[PDB]
């Protein structure tokens, strides 16, 4: 069943997630959605409190991921529940307990007696027509040989006990649905009609009557009840007989159409006769209220609290393991919980946030206008989970069974899924402070890595944590900057004291890019791409301050003079970002690299890093410069011209022509890969008449 | 004696011939692989093949029986040599780094019909280093 559920929920995911679903097939009836939610939660809890079996845990995780993907993250948890669920019917012993509903306590109201009598007359009439069609004729004595029956008299001349035989099924059929609560009323139409008021019986050819579609469902349930009743007293006959299992004892669902035919027919005939009398039947329950605005009932909400506190005791268990590391016994009952964590929680996070990338980013902003609204406090707790995962992965590489790569993967895609709604309008102060304590702690962690690498260059714990830093932390923060840049959330997400932390991280990365070692060689890509992010598409103007004093967003201008002089705020841009060279310096450096063209053997990291930088701040401001809007000039953070990209791109592809001669490059392919976005943003018909060398140098 | 990773490598190889996943390779199940590789084995030959390896005599090879014959073959370092050999024949460019440009030739070489733009999109995660060109280092991690 695990594999069956996985395959079904992977193949038919659109049927559940998309409001339209499959065009031909349709969409769920919300009952399938309730069943899927119950299955997901049951499997998740059972796996949580289940002992680790490798095969079972490797088959259960795909099922959970598929069910989570199929379930809409904005799913509506109905307060309405099901009618007396038949869980005990499919019990382990016997496989079928046919318990019916009890109707002894309930009593039928009096006004229904006219309906009861009329339907009894109708049943007697069809009875007579059937067997004077078979050939039975009224006689005074009951003889089987001559097929004559004294009971062939009209309903009025029938004896009282003869009327009761029709009445009994009628009143039980009414009481089973009255005790179920279904409201039966009768209109002013029937009331007017009731006021209006050998026999030849002529019953209504009721076959032409048809029911409403809800009425078909109601007839189905009441037929299932009738079959449960029959199976119940049949089963009692079976234990009285001590065997002889009836082939039709199988449940209603297992029954076939031919077997269901008579029971259904009884359902339709009784309901259609009720309609033809004009009695109005309806559902037994009043809809009380639907609490749509409530985030509590959100599936993503429930999933996130589950994930949130699971990571919570995971982190405090890791604290307990750190405290017991002073001891001798590392074996604990929590091995089950940590394998559960590393094998389910992280992969489930990854698959869920891959499948629902759009949901948590845009709360029905414009993609998928049908829905996809992610709640705002759901957004802030997504950010809180981001922070807490970042803190948990801090200094636990040995405890992780080489799954730290998976943790970094989940963490960076979650960073991509991060969105800034909460920070713009409303965000919990504790969550804000916690996650940006995460940011600054990453800052001084990278710092203490640089000082310990400068104190002792030899490369244990400090070495593995330096590898952790250069593998996770810098690519992580760079992907953070990437998604903020692509979403244009920078200039308003990174307003206050965050820009101080960003100058700190910036200076740290800058000393990293000026320093060289084997770890720096390993992190060449991370350094290049983060500094990239920085220096042609990045939110702040860290190079050009000369026009930043006029920027309204500018840090010093946003926070006046009082607190700036008071706090650890260095009172000058060059003071807060000292080791950073200016634009004049960092672009005369680019031009001198151009006419120089150093061999890759002497000064490699410069031409391996220096171009993508220019690629992700420089064109933040190629769109943002005056070349796009003559108004709002001198309000801009910096001034940067399409001719400036023309010069710098001429520079870069000329030094690429110089590049192709030095061992043909995996890293000049670094710059090429990161430059297709740059040159694609570049206005193409500049690229024509300037691309002439690149095709002969490229087919070389 | 065999490395646990080499056990896992023999796991996936064992399941490669065991499509139905029951842990037993029947003569016909083995025969499908041989015909897929172009060779036409007689039914009698296939029985002779499995019988030599089937110590139990059930007629279908189990994994413990599969390991014993694995040990009987001196495949001590041939696995990565084949992986290295795959890397060089895959790099028809001969640069020591396989480029997405040659990826369009090799997709036709195997016969796979996976679309090329997705192949480049997968090669952006296959290249965790990112080179835009797969080396032996990025080859082994992929394998
Ligand atoms: Ca098999
Ligand atoms: Ca065998
Ligand atoms: Ca090559
Ligand atoms: Ca690579």
From Swiss-Prot, chain A:
Phosphoserine sites (modified residues): 92, 192, 325
PTM comment: Channel activity is modulated by phosphorylation. Phosphorylation is increased in failing heart, leading to calcium leaks and increased cytoplasmic Ca(2+) levels.
S-S pairs: none
Subcellular location: Sarcoplasmic reticulum membrane
Sequence repeats: 87-197, 198-303
Tissues showing expression: Detected in heart muscle (at protein level). Heart muscle, brain (cerebellum and hippocampus) and placenta.
Domain-level remarks: The calcium release channel activity resides in the C-terminal region while the remaining part of the protein resides in the cytoplasm.
Function: Cytosolic calcium-activated calcium channel that mediates the release of Ca(2+) from the sarcoplasmic reticulum into the cytosol and thereby plays a key role in triggering cardiac muscle contraction. Aberrant channel activation can lead to cardiac arrhythmia. In cardiac myocytes, calcium release is triggered by increased Ca(2+) cytosolic levels due to activation of the L-type calcium channel CACNA1C. The calcium channel activity is modulated by formation of heterotetramers with RYR3. Required for cellular calcium ion homeostasis. Required for embryonic heart development.
Family stated for the protein in its record: Belongs to the ryanodine receptor (TC 1.A.3.1) family. RYR2 subfamily.
Known partners and oligomeric status: Homotetramer. Can also form heterotetramers with RYR1 and RYR3. Interacts with FKBP1A and FKBP1B; these interactions may stabilize the channel in its closed state and prevent Ca(2+) leaks. Interacts with CALM and S100A1; these interactions regulate channel activity. Identified in a complex composed of RYR2, FKBP1B, PKA catalytic subunit, PRKAR2A, AKAP6, and the protein phosphatases PP2A and PP1. Interacts directly with FKBP1B, PKA, PP1 and PP2A. Interacts with SELENON. In cardiac muscles, identified in a complex, composed of FSD2, CMYA5 and RYR2.
Disease implication from the record: Ventricular tachycardia, catecholaminergic polymorphic, 1, with or without atrial dysfunction and/or dilated cardiomyopathy: An arrhythmogenic disorder characterized by stress-induced, bidirectional ventricular tachycardia that may degenerate into cardiac arrest and cause sudden death. Patients present with recurrent syncope, seizures, or sudden death after physical activity or emotional stress. CPVT1 inheritance is autosomal dominant.
Name under which the protein is recorded: Ryanodine receptor 2
Protein source organism: Homo sapiens
Gene: RYR2
Swiss-Prot record, chain B:
One GO term of the biological process aspect: cellular response to type II interferon
Positions contributing to Ca(2+) 1 binding: 18, 20, 22, 24, 29
Phosphothreonine sites (modified residues): 42, 108
Entry keyword Cytoplasm: yes
SUPFAM superfamilies in the record: EF-hand
Segments forming domain EF-hand: 5-40, 41-76, 78-113, 114-143
Subcellular location: Cytoplasm, Cytoskeleton, Spindle; Cytoplasm, Cytoskeleton, Spindle pole; Cytoplasm, Cytoskeleton, Microtubule organizing center, Centrosome; Cell projection, Cilium, Flagellum
Binding site residues for Ca(2+) 4: 127, 129, 131, 133, 138
Region spans: Necessary and sufficient for interaction with PCP4: 74-143
Record remark on domains: The N-terminal and C-terminal lobes of CALM bind to the C-terminus of KCNQ1 in a clamp-like conformation. Binding of CALM C-terminus to KCNQ1 is calcium-independent but is essential for assembly of the structure. Binding of CALM N-terminus to KCNQ1 is calcium-dependent and regulates electrophysiological activity of the channel. The C-lobe interacts with KCNN4 channels in a calcium-independent manner, whereas the N-lobe interacts with the S4-S5 linker of KCNN4 in a calcium-dependent manner playing a role as calcium sensor and gating the channel.
Family affiliation: Belongs to the calmodulin family.
The protein's name in its UniProt record: Calmodulin-1
Gene: CALM1
